Homo-oligomer: A and B are copies of this chain.
Amino acid sequence: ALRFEALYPEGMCPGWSVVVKGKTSSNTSMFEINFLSHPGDQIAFHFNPRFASSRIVCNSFLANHWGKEEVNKTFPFEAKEPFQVEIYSDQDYFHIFIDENKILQYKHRQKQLSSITKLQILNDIEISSVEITKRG
């Protein structure tokens, strides 16, 4: 289910930090954080921690197809333990920090960054906070 959605028509990429605090119920759950662009809610960046397998899967859903998966080895989450995920974008990458440590970066595939206007948080995450801040 959709847990949280935000829309910022002026564009929240690049130069914005999104900080999500919360926790996940079981060690077989998953949640996702999506950055979506107009028109047609294409997913510029899909961040998907899968607790069943302890993998973070990142990808993009553009022109109605998932692209090449980028899977991160390290899994700094624990079921039912509060976490903090920060996603920050510059002109080249989305940068992911978890509990303040740099975890991965994801090269822009959707290159029209100003069209990225929507944030979606889905599935197994009990959100305690969402912060969307311009960092430059």
Q: Which residues of A are in contact with B by a Cβ distance under 8 Å?
A: 1-10, 21, 127-134
Residues of B within 8 A of A1 (CB): 9
Number of chain copies forming the complex: 2
Distance A134 CA – B127 CA, assembled complex (angstroms): 8
Task: Let me know if A131 and B134 touch, CB within 8 A.
Answer: no
Task: Let me know if B129 and A129 touch, CB within 8 A.
Answer: no
Residues of B within 8 A of A129 (CB): 131-134
Task: Let me know if B5 and A127 touch, CB within 8 A.
Answer: no
Residues of B within 8 A of A128 (CB): 133-134
Task: Let me know if A6 and B5 touch, CB within 8 A.
Answer: yes
Distance A129 CA – B12 CA, assembled complex (angstroms): 11
Given contacts A131-B131, A132-B130, A133-B128, contact A7 B4 (CB under 8 A): yes
Q: For the complex formed, measure the closest distance between the CB of A126 and the CB atoms of chain B, giving whole angstroms.
A: 9
From B2, B5, B10, B131, A130 is in contact (CB under 8 Å) with B131
Task: Let me know if B10 and A7 touch, CB within 8 A.
Answer: no
Residues of B within 8 A of A6 (CB): 4-7, 130
Q: For the complex formed, measure the closest distance between the CB of A7 and the CB atoms of chain B, giving whole angstroms.
A: 4
Distance A101 CA – B3 CA, assembled complex (angstroms): 31
Residues of B within 8 A of A9 (CB): 1-3
Distance A128 CA – B10 CA, assembled complex (angstroms): 12
Q: List 7 A-B contacts (CB under 8 A).
A: A1-B9, A2-B9, A128-B134, A130-B131, A131-B131, A131-B132, A131-B133
